[PDB]
Design an enzyme around this catalytic site. Structure first.
Site, PDB file in Angstrom:
ATOM      1  N   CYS A 178       4.735 -12.570 -12.055  1.00 35.87           N
ATOM      2  CA  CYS A 178       4.262 -13.787 -11.336  1.00 35.87           C
ATOM      3  C   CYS A 178       2.747 -13.703 -11.131  1.00 35.87           C
ATOM      4  O   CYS A 178       2.006 -14.574 -11.541  1.00 35.87           O
ATOM      5  CB  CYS A 178       4.955 -13.875  -9.976  1.00 35.87           C
ATOM      6  SG  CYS A 178       6.662 -13.289 -10.130  1.00 35.87           S
ATOM      7  N   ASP A 236       1.150 -10.731  -8.664  1.00 35.79           N
ATOM      8  CA  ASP A 236       0.947 -10.051  -7.352  1.00 35.79           C
ATOM      9  C   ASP A 236       0.424  -8.632  -7.592  1.00 35.79           C
ATOM     10  O   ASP A 236       0.897  -7.926  -8.459  1.00 35.79           O
ATOM     11  CB  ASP A 236       2.277  -9.984  -6.599  1.00 35.79           C
ATOM     12  CG  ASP A 236       3.094 -11.244  -6.890  1.00 35.79           C
ATOM     13  OD1 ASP A 236       2.504 -12.227  -7.306  1.00 35.79           O
ATOM     14  OD2 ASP A 236       4.299 -11.204  -6.693  1.00 35.79           O
ATOM     15  N   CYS A 286      -0.820 -11.485  -2.525  1.00 36.67           N
ATOM     16  CA  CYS A 286       0.391 -12.147  -1.963  1.00 36.67           C
ATOM     17  C   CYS A 286       0.202 -12.350  -0.458  1.00 36.67           C
ATOM     18  O   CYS A 286       0.278 -11.418   0.318  1.00 36.67           O
ATOM     19  CB  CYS A 286       1.616 -11.264  -2.209  1.00 36.67           C
ATOM     20  SG  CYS A 286       2.925 -11.707  -1.041  1.00 36.67           S
ATOM     21  N   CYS A 335       8.702  -7.678  -3.068  1.00 36.31           N
ATOM     22  CA  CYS A 335       7.972  -6.828  -2.085  1.00 36.31           C
ATOM     23  C   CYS A 335       8.638  -5.453  -2.004  1.00 36.31           C
ATOM     24  O   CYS A 335       8.141  -4.480  -2.536  1.00 36.31           O
ATOM     25  CB  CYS A 335       8.010  -7.494  -0.708  1.00 36.31           C
ATOM     26  SG  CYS A 335       6.594  -8.610  -0.539  1.00 36.31           S
TER      27      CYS A 335
END
Length: 134
Positions: free
Chosen positions: A37, A39, A63, A106
Site C-alpha cells: 500500500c 507504509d 501511516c 500494523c
C-alpha cells in the site's frame, strides 16, 4: 591466546567508548514497511545494560495511526531482553489491542520490525569484512 578464563572480546567496544552510532553490535537496527500500500516503519532497540534493553527508539512516518502501537511495542521491550524480543508474536499485540482484520498491516510491521532489529543485531558480527583499501 588467553591465559585467563575470559573469552569476552571487550567490555564495550574497541573504539575507545562510544555507544549509539547506528553502527555497533550493541545496537540492532530494523527498517521494514508494507509495499502492498505505502507504509514505512522503522524500529531500533538498544542493548547494553548487560545484554538487556535499556532504551528503545523508533520512527514511523507514513501511516497516520500506526504510531500508537509503535509506542506499545517500543514500551513492551523497553526493559526486556533480546531473548524475549526474539519470541513475541504479532498476535500478542493484536489481542491486547483488539483490532479488525482490516488493519493487521500494523501488528505485522510490529513483530516483523523486531525481527529486522534482531537479524541486523546478530549480523553485525558474522562474516564482517575482509578488504577495505583506505
Amino acid at each position: 591466546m588467553a591465559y585467563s578464563e575470559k573469552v569476552i572480546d571487550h567490555y564495550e567496544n574497541p573504539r575507545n567508548v562510544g555507544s549509539l552510532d547506528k553502527k555497533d553490535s550493541n545496537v540492532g537496527t530494523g527498517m521494514v514497511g508494507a509495499p502492498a500500500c505505502g507504509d514505512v516503519m522503522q524500529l531500533q532497540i538498544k542493548v547494553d545494560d548487560n545484554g538487556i534493553i535499556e532504551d528503545a527508539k523508533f520512527k514511523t512516518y507514513g501511516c497516520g495511526s500506526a504510531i500508537a502501537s509503535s509506542s506499545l511495542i517500543t514500551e513492551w521491550v523497553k526493559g526486556k531482553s533480546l531473548e524475549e524480543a526474539g519470541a513475541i508474536k504479532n498476535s500478542q499485540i493484536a489481542e491486547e489491542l483488539e483490532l479488525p482484520p482490516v488493519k493487521v498491516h500494523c501488528s505485522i510491521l510490529a513483530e516483523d520490525a523486531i525481527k529486522a532489529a534482531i537479524a541486523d543485531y546478530k549480523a553485525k558480527q558474522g562474516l564482517e569484512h575482509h578488504h577495505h583499501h583506505h
